[PDB]
Amino acid sequence: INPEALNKHIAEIIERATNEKPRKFLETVELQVGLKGYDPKKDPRFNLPNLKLCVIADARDADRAKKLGLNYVEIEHLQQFNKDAKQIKKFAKSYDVFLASKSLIRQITVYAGPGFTKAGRTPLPLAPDEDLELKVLECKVQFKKAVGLNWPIGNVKMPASEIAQNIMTTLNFLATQLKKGWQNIKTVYIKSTMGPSHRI
Amino acid sequence: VTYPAERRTFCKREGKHTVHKASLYKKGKDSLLAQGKRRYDRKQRGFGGQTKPIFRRKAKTTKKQVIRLTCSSCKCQTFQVLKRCHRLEISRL
Amino acid sequence: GGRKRQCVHGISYGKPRNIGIVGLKPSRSLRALAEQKVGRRLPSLRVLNSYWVAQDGSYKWYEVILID
Amino acid sequence: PGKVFNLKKGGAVVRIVRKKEERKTKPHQEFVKSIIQECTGMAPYEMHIIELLRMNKDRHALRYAKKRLGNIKRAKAKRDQLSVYARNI
RNA sequence: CCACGCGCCGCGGCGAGCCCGAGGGAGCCCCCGCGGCGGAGCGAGCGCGAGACGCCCCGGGCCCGCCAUGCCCCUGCGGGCG
RNA sequence: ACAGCGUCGCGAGGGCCGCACCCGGCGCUGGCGCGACGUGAUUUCUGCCCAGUGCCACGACCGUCACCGUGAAGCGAUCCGC
RNA sequence: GCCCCUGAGACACCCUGACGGCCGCCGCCGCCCCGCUCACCCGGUCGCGCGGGGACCCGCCCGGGCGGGGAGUUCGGCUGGGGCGGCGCGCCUGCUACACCGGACCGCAGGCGUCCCACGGCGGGCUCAGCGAGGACGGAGACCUCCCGCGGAGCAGAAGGGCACAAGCCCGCCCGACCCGCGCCCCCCGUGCCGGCGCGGGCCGCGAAAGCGGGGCCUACCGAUCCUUCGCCGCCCCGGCCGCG
RNA sequence: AGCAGAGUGGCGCAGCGGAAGCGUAGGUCGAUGGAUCGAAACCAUCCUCUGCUACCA
C-alpha cells in the first residue's frame, strides 16, 4: 500500500488532468473501495464522520459570511420554498454544503424542516458568536446497501501526501466498521476526475 | 404477559438504580467441549447402546421466562424470572 | 482386517455391552500374529524377531528370524 | 502450584550442567541423504506441499502437512524444508 | 462362626505424644525397629491461620478461616485496625 | 397333507439359503427350471375399493438426508459454508 | 452537456460496484465417460494345438440407511380379590369432624398447573350495588338528576374469610414484579420443598410529610443430585510463562 | 431441536418491488416490525402448517 507511487501518479496528473478544476488539485480525488464478504441482508451499514455551499443566518454570522463571500441568505425564502416543492429541492441540489443559524433554528425545524429532510441535506445551524468558516473546514464513511463505496478523498489543492493521509484515515475506520476489516476490502483504485484508475 | 422495553433496576457495577433494556434469555447451543459432553460421548462410544437416561414424560406446558435486563450505562446484565406463562411479549421502544 | 467374534448365527447372548461381532479390533498386532503363526508351523526352532517386508490391500507380509 | 514456596531457595551450590551442544545433524548423514534424494526424489505429499508453496498458498500447505504428518512442529518444519526447493526454483 | 470395615462402650499401658510394621539381630514369649495416627483449623481454590475468660457441664463473650464492608498505611487487588 | 388352481422372484456376473472365517446347499440344475408363498379335486363362479398400511419402479431426484472431499476464517485445537 | 428538465435515482466528461450473459485462460478444484493390460477376477482343457472380463468388481477400513431375522430388558401405584374405569398419585376452600390442636373414607359441594408492566407500587380524590321519586325523543331497558343508601357492589379465576374519606373506583407519577446477608412459621422425623412472614444493610419509587412498597386482600397456582446453558467477580490448570480453551 | 417450503377475493390459486387477478360482488395477501420512491413479495420476529431428519433437559 505504498503511498508514493499513487501520490506521484496524482502529481503527474497535475499536468495530465487539466479540466475546469474549480478550486481543485487539477481534479477532485475519488476512491472506489471494492468490498468482498458484503451482503445486503447482513447489516454492516454505518453512516459516520471545493463543493458549493450555502449559509442562512441572522446578524454577525451573515456579516462574517459576507466578508468571506460564502453564501449568506435569510428565512424569507422559506415561504416561497413552501409554495414550490421543486424550489426546496433546487436550493438543496445547488449547494452541496448546507449551513443555518442556531438563533433561527425554530424556523429551520418547521419552515425548512420537511423539504430539506426529504431531500436528505440538513443545514448545519451556526449561531452569530460561532465561526462558520471553521465549521466549513470540518466539511464521509457510509456503507448503505452498496458493496462499491465511493467518497471524494479531497477536492482540496493540498499536497498529495496530505491527501494520502486522508485516504489512510478512512481505510482504518472502514476496517473498524467492517466484520473482517481490511480482509473485507478487495481492490481499491485512485483516479483523477477524468484520470485512469490506479490500484492502491 | 407483556414486559416493558426498559425497567429501572439496580446495576451492581454502578451500585445505583439505572435504566435497563429488556430482552428474552435463550439457552445457548451445547458445547461439545464440556465436562459432561466429553464424558457422555466417551460413554456412548462403543457397543452397549444408550448408557444415559432419556426423559420422555414431559408434563410442564409452560417454561419460566428470564428477561435479560442490560443497563445502558454500566453494561450490567440482570435476569428477572417471570411466573410460568404461555405467551410473553416485550413492548417495543 | 478387524476381529470378527466366533459366535454361531452371529449372536452373542448376554448383557448388551458384550454384543458386537464384526466391529472388534485384534488385541495383538499383525506382526505378533505372524510370529505366532510360524511358531506353530516350526515348533522346534526358536523365534528371534520379525520385520515388515511388504503390504497389500488384503494381506500384510512379515519376515521372521528363527534360530535352530 | 507445583513448586514449594521458599524465598531463599538455594542453600547448596548447584552443578546444573547439561554440558551438551544441540545434537549435531552430522555431515555424513547429510551426505547419505543427498545420494538417496537423487535416487528417490520426493514423496507425493511433499510434491503437493511444494505446489501449494510455489503458488502463494502457505496456510493451505501447513494444513495439508498437519493432516499428512499429524504434528505442527513436523508440519511447519516440512513446509520450511520443501520451501527451499520451490524458493531455489 | 470367622475375616474385614465402621460406630459406640468398658478396661490395660503410656502421654502431646503413641505404636510386637516390614524386617534385622546365633536370635525362639527376648532386644531393636519407619511410615502412620494424634498434636490446627477453615476455605472450591488462591491460600490464610486460633488465647479471654472457664473444677466440670452448658450458655454467653471473644479469636481463626470463609463471605462482605469501612478506614489507615509500610515493602502495596499488599499489610494493619475495626 | 394332497392333485388342481393362482400369485411372486430369478438369464447365472443371477436368485434364494447356509456361514467366525475359509467358504458351502439348491445345482450331475437352468425358466415344461429352481426358490418363495396363498388357496385346496371337480362343477359353477370369484363383484367393488390403491383411502390406510405393505410392495414396486435403469419413475424422477424436489426437499431433507452421511462420511469423505472442498472453500473461507483462525495461533492452532477448531468453526462455519459447499 | 450544463443553469435547465424537475425525477426514487440528473443522462457533457471519467473511473468503478453489483447482476446476468458470452469467449478465453490456469504446474487450480470437483465430476463424468472411453480405452488398454500389466495387477485382479472367472470359464475351458488331460494346460492337444483356448477364451470372457479388467482398473471395474471383490476384499478391507470409515460413513449413512434397511433390519423382531434375531438378542438383552421393561411393561407403575391406589383399589371392600383383581380387571374395567377413575385418581385423597402434588396442591387448595367450605364441609362430614364430635367448639384448643390432631383425626380415616374409590365420603360430599367444588377448584389448581393459569391470567395481568397492569389486574403492580404509592399518594390524592371519590363511593358502590341499588331502592324510591323525577327529566324531548326513550319504551322493561341506556342518559341525566337528587335523596336514602353496613355494603345487599367490586376486588382475574374454587370456596371461605377480609375490606368503605378502602383493600372497591378514578386520576397522577412510577417500577420494590430491585440488590446483599440472615432468621421464623405451615407440612414436619419436627428433614426437604412450595407458600407466606419478620429483619439487618444497600439502592430506589410515591407522598407536603408521617409513612408504605421484595407484586396482584388472605388461604391454591409448582420441582432434588448429576448434566447443560447463562450472568457476576475472582481463583486453578500442579516445572514455568503468554494467548486460546 | 435443525433444514427446507407454504399460508392471497366466498372458496381455491397465480402474481419474482411498480394491475392484486384468474379459475370457480368478492383482499388483516397468517399477522407484526423494519426496508424502500413504493414489498403479497426483500428482510427479521412470531402464530401456524407440511416434508425430512435429530435426541444424557
UniProtKB/TrEMBL annotation, chain A:
Pfam families: Ribosomal_L1 (PF00687). GO terms for cellular component: cytosolic large ribosomal subunit. The keyword Ligase does not apply. Signal peptide: none annotated. Keywords: Ribonucleoprotein, Ribosomal protein. It comes from the Eukaryota. One of its GO terms (biological process) is translation. One of its GO terms (molecular function) is structural constituent of ribosome. SUPFAM superfamilies: Ribosomal protein L1. Belongs to the universal ribosomal protein uL1 family. This is Ribosomal protein L10a. The lineage of its organism: Eukaryota, Metamonada, Diplomonadida, Hexamitidae, Giardiinae.
Automatic annotation (TrEMBL), chain B:
The keyword Kinase does not apply. Belongs to the eukaryotic ribosomal protein eL42 family. It comes from Giardia intestinalis (strain ATCC 50803 / WB clone C6) (Giardia lamblia). It holds the Pfam family Ribosomal_L44. InterPro entries: Ribosomal_eL44 (IPR000552), Ribosomal_LSU_eL42 (IPR053708), Ribosomal_zn-bd (IPR011332). GO terms for cellular component: cytosolic large ribosomal subunit. Disulfide bonds join C11-C74, C11-C76, C71-C74, C74-C76. This is Ribosomal protein L44. Keywords: Metal-binding, Ribonucleoprotein, Ribosomal protein. Mg(2+) binds at C11, E14, C71, C74. GO terms for biological process: cytoplasmic translation. One of its GO terms (molecular function) is structural constituent of ribosome.
Automatic annotation (TrEMBL), chain C:
It comes from the Eukaryota. Belongs to the eukaryotic ribosomal protein eL15 family. This is Ribosomal protein L15. It comes from Giardia intestinalis (strain ATCC 50803 / WB clone C6). The chain holds residues 69 to 136 of 204 of the full protein.
UniProtKB/TrEMBL annotation, chain D:
GO terms for biological process: cytoplasmic translation. One of its GO terms (cellular component) is cytosolic large ribosomal subunit. It comes from the Eukaryota. InterPro entries: Ribosomal_eL36, Ribosomal_eL36_sf. One of its GO terms (molecular function) is structural constituent of ribosome. Transmembrane segments: none annotated. This is Ribosomal protein L36e. It comes from Giardia intestinalis (strain ATCC 50803 / WB clone C6) (Giardia lamblia). The lineage of its organism: Eukaryota, Metamonada, Diplomonadida, Hexamitidae, Giardiinae.
